C-alpha cells in the first residue's frame, strides 16, 4: 500500500531517551521509515525550545493533503542545518526513536509509504 494508518505514540521532549535516527539525511528518513514500520517510532510535538534539545538531522511530518478514518495524511521532510529534503504541509511534529516513554497521547496519520 502507498499509505499506512498509523497510530504515533506523542512523547514529551524531556523523556525522549534517543533524540535522533542518525547521522545523515538519508539515514534519518531511512530509519524513520523502518521505525514507523515496526511500531517503534514517537511524535514530539515542536514548540520554543524543543527542537534544540533534540539531535540534527530532525525528520518531520508534514500535513500532504487538506483526513480518512480521522487519519491526517503525512509525508516525512528531513532538516539538517536549516535545509530541508522535501516539501509539504503544515509540521504535525518531529519523529524519534520509541523504546517504551509514556506517551500523553496519540496522533492518527496516514503515512505516505
Same mark, same amino acid.
Given at each position: 500500500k502507498t499509505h499506512v494508518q498509523l497510530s504515533l505514540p506523542v512523547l514529551q521532549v524531556r523523556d525522549v531517551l534517543v533524540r535522533g535516527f542518525g547521522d545523515? !539525511? #538519508?539515514? *534519518?528518513?531511512?530509519?524513520? /521509515? =523502518?521505525? $514507523? &514500520?515496526?511500531?517503534?517510532?514517537? $511524535? !514530539? #510535538? *515542536? #514548540? &520554543?525550545? *524543543?527542537? @534544540? =534539545? $533534540? #539531535? =540534527? @538531522?530532525? *525528520?518531520?511530518? &508534514? /500535513?500532504?493533503?487538506?483526513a480518512p478514518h480521522g487519519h491526517v495524511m503525512v509525508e516525512l521532510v528531513a532538516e539538517l542545518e536549516g535545509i530541508q529534503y522535501g516539501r509539504s504541509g503544515e509540521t504535525l511534529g518531529v519523529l524519534v526513536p520509541h523504546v517504551g516513554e509514556i506517551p500523553v497521547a496519540y496522533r492518527k496519520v496516514l503515512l505516505r509509504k
Open positions: 545523515s !539525511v #538519508e539515514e *534519518v528518513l531511512s530509519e524513520a /521509515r =523502518q521505525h $514507523l &514500520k515496526d511500531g517503534t517510532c514517537g $511524535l !514530539v #510535538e *515542536v #514548540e &520554543k525550545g *524543543v527542537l @534544540p =534539545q $533534540l #539531535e =540534527q @538531522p530532525y *525528520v518531520f511530518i &508534514k /500535513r500532504s493533503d487538506a
